[PDB]
Amino acid sequence: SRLLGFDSIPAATTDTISLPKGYKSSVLISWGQPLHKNGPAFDPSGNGTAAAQEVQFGDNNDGMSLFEFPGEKNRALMAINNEYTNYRYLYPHGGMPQSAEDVRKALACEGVSVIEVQRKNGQWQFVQGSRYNRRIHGNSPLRISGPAAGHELMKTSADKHGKKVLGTFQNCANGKTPWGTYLTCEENFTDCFGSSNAQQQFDPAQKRYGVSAASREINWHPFDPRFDMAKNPNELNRHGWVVEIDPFDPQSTPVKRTALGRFKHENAALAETDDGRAVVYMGDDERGEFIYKFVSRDKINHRNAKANRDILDHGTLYVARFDAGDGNPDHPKGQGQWIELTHGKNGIDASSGFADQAEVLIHARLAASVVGATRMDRPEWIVVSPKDGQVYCTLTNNAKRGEDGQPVGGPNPREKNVYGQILRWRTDRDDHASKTFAWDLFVVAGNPSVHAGTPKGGSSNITPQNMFNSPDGLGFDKAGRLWILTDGDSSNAGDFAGMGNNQMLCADPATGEIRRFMVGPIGCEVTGISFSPDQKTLFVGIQHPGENGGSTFPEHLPNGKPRSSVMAITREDGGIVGAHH
Numbered sequence: 098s099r100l101l102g103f104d105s106i107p108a109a110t111t112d113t114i115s116l117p118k119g120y121k122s123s124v125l126i127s128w129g130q131p132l133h134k135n136g137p138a139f140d141p142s143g144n145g146t147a148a149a150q151e152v153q154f155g156d157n158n159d160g161m162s163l164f165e166f167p168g169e170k171n172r173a174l175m176a177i178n179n180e181y182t183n184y185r186y187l188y189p190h191g192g193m194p195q196s197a198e199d200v201r202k203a204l205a206c207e208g209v210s211v212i213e214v215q216r217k218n219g220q221w222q223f224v225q226g227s228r229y230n231r232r233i234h235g236n237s238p239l240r241i242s243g244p245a246a247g248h249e250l251m252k253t254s255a256d257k258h259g260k261k262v263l264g265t266f267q268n269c270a271n272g273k274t275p276w277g278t279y280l281t282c283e284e285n286f287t288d289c290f291g292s293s294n295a296q297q298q299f300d301p302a303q304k305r306y307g308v309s310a311a312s313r314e315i316n317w318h319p320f321d322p323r324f325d326m327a328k329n330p331n332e333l334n335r336h337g338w339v340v341e342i343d344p345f346d347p348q349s350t351p352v353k354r355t356a357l358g359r360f361k362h363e364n365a366a367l368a369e370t371d372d373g374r375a376v377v378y379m380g381d382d383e384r385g386e387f388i389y390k391f392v393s394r395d396k397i398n399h400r401n402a403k404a405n406r407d408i409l410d411h412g413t414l415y416v417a418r419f420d421a422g423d424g425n426p427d428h429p430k431g432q433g434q435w436i437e438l439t440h441g442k443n444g445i446d447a448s449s450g451f452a453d454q455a456e457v458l459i460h461a462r463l464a465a466s467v468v469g470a471t472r473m474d475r476p477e478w479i480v481v482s483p484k485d486g487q488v489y490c491t492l493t494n495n496a497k498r499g500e501d502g503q504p505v506g507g508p509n510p511r512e513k514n515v516y517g518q519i520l521r522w523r524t525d526r527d528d529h530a531s532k533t534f535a536w537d538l539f540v541v542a543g544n545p546s547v548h549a550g551t552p553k554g555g556s557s558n559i560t561p562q563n564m565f566n567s568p569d570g571l572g573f574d575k576a577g578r579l580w581i582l583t584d585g586d587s588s589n590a591g592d593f594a595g596m597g598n599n600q601m602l603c604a605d606p607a608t609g610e611i612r613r614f615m616v617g618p619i620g621c622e623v624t625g626i627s628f629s630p631d632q633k634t635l636f637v638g639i640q641h642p643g644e645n646g647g648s649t650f651p652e653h654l655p656n657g658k659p660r661s662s663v664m665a666i667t668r669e670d671g672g673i674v675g676a677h678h
């Protein structure tokens with residue numbers, strides 16, 4: 098292969114980072130790192146405070162973007178998401194929150210960490226004390242904008258006007274705008290709400306989003322009533338949005354962009370129409386949910402960044418329908434379309450339960466079902482190829498495929514999907530404004546060693562040497578290599594025998610060839626990806642190392658606490674990551 102310059106490495110089960118020959122890794126930052134001058138040091142005992150966590154690098158680092166510092170090639174900002182927290186390591190008691198202070202500590206773990214990095218002697222390093230360093234957390238005051246801003250369904254007792262919300266949490270993956278802003282995505286936000294009333298009666302919209310009275314083992318609602326649906330039901334509507342952050346302004350207020358819809362947002366892939374308008378592809382990560390696309394009203398003003406302040410507040414939100422395709426078992430392919438989610442069109446009106454456009458966006462999932470969007474196998478990250486504009490999306494898995502309502506077909510070709518697949522689409526005329534597209538499955542993951550010759554053996558570009566499961570993250574480098582990050586079953590047994598720990602692989606889009614590049618430590622998942630502008634440093638996140646107690650990564654101190662870290666991957670020879678030596 099032209100694009101793949103290294104030799105595929107074996108699967109590993111070790112509590113370390115395994116890379117190919119000539120590559121090295123270094124810790125950039127880890128959960129608990131104080132961001133500010135003379136900031137509180139990380140407390141390994143779990144006795145660190147909530148206020149200290151609001152000024153320290155958050156937990157379970159996930160999606161991230163690197164931003165070129167104008168006029169300074171040896172400086173950059175990185176905006177990094179903090180998705181959730183690991184109670185076993187967060188509290189000394191290692192269990193459920195037991196107080197309001199414990200609840201505040203967990204909300205402090207989530208959100209975004211903006212940091213400055215500098216290049217010293219060729220290596221990028223975290224800059225503690227930088228004026229750009231900032232924590233945006235679960236209690237940070239944010240702004241609401243777009244068509245749903247100020248609506249009755251967005252009003253609460255604490256916020257009577259429906260334009261101010263406390264925080265961003267469950268921050269999964271990201272977007273990087275061409276106008277120098279960061280998009281952070283609220284994914285499993287519903288897990289954080291419960292009800293003091295166990296017999297709480299939830300309405301269709303709330304049930305469709307998956308809220309429960311018990312919460313999903315988070316339990317903030319018994320101590321913080323903002324999360325208690327019996328007391329603040331509409332707080333559920335003020336989360337599950339795409340939030341826009343300016344990393345270059347530490348005194349700016351982030352904005353929830355309600356025109357991009359409300360759902361369990363994984364990431365946001367930027368593109369541009371041939372007439373210059375912003376396009377944002379977006380996945381809703383839940384079994385049988387949809388793939389969306391937002392197109393801005395206005396053209397991107399590339400020459401004046403601040404002229405695009407309100408670009409994501411005006412446009413059209415669409416949802417995907419995929420046809421049955423040709424049924425080819427190794428490489429199925431077909432056509433699809435984008436259906437508009439606008440009040441008054443496609444049977445979206447008072448009769449189907451939408452009084453206005455704000456309701457269409459607050460209840461995007463319900464509006465997408467009305468227009469007949471295709472139910473998918475957990476859409477996770479999306480990426481647009483920088484060389485030809487083809488779009489790639491992971492469908493991580495779907496153990497419910499084949500059950501009543503989720504039939505087997507087109508881009509979801511297997512029942513009880515434990516491995517996943519990567520879906521590709523080419524927009525018509527290579528214009529991102531087109532309402533139709535050709536689709537194909539770039540890869541169908543599987544285990545050819547244990548299920549040779551069957552659908553569970555995967556597509557032909559999966560071999561016993563490169564096999565993996567549950568692809569989640571994706572990233573392109575400038576050369577056009579596709580980097581696949583996994584968040585799967587690390588048992589290394591049964592269906593996953595020979596797969597080992599979670600990994601990162603590299604693929605050639607034109608050939609379909611895939612090669613294992615990295616293996617992560619015990620109990621982690623590999624998520625988050627950014628490159629230095631020169632492509633000589635690949636930054637990757639290691640999330641929840643030792644989630645089931647088998648890790649001391651990265652420090653490996655005696656009886657050590659494992660810490661979610663951001664890693665800097667480089668070549669000893671100083672060359673471009675993934676390229677030939």
Ligand SMILES: Nc1ncnc2c1ncn2[C@@H]1O[C@H](COP(=O)(O)OP(=O)(O)CP(=O)(O)O)[C@@H](O)[C@H]1O
Pocket residue numbers: 269284285313382383384475493569584
């Ligand atoms: N009690 C429950 N009821 C319903 N859905 C649940 C659930 N527990 C987890 N899920 C969902 O089932 C899927 C698989 O769970 P899991 O936590 O293993 O996935 P994940 O590790 O892929 C989360 P992420 O999307 O952040 O990577 C996810 O979409 C998760 O949100």
Ligand SMILES: [Ca+2]
Pocket residue numbers: 269363477569570584624
């Ligand atoms: Ca993910």
Ligand SMILES: [Ca+2]
Pocket residue numbers: 477493569584
């Ligand atoms: Ca996942």
Ligand SMILES: [Ca+2]
Pocket residue numbers: 584622
């Ligand atoms: Ca995960």
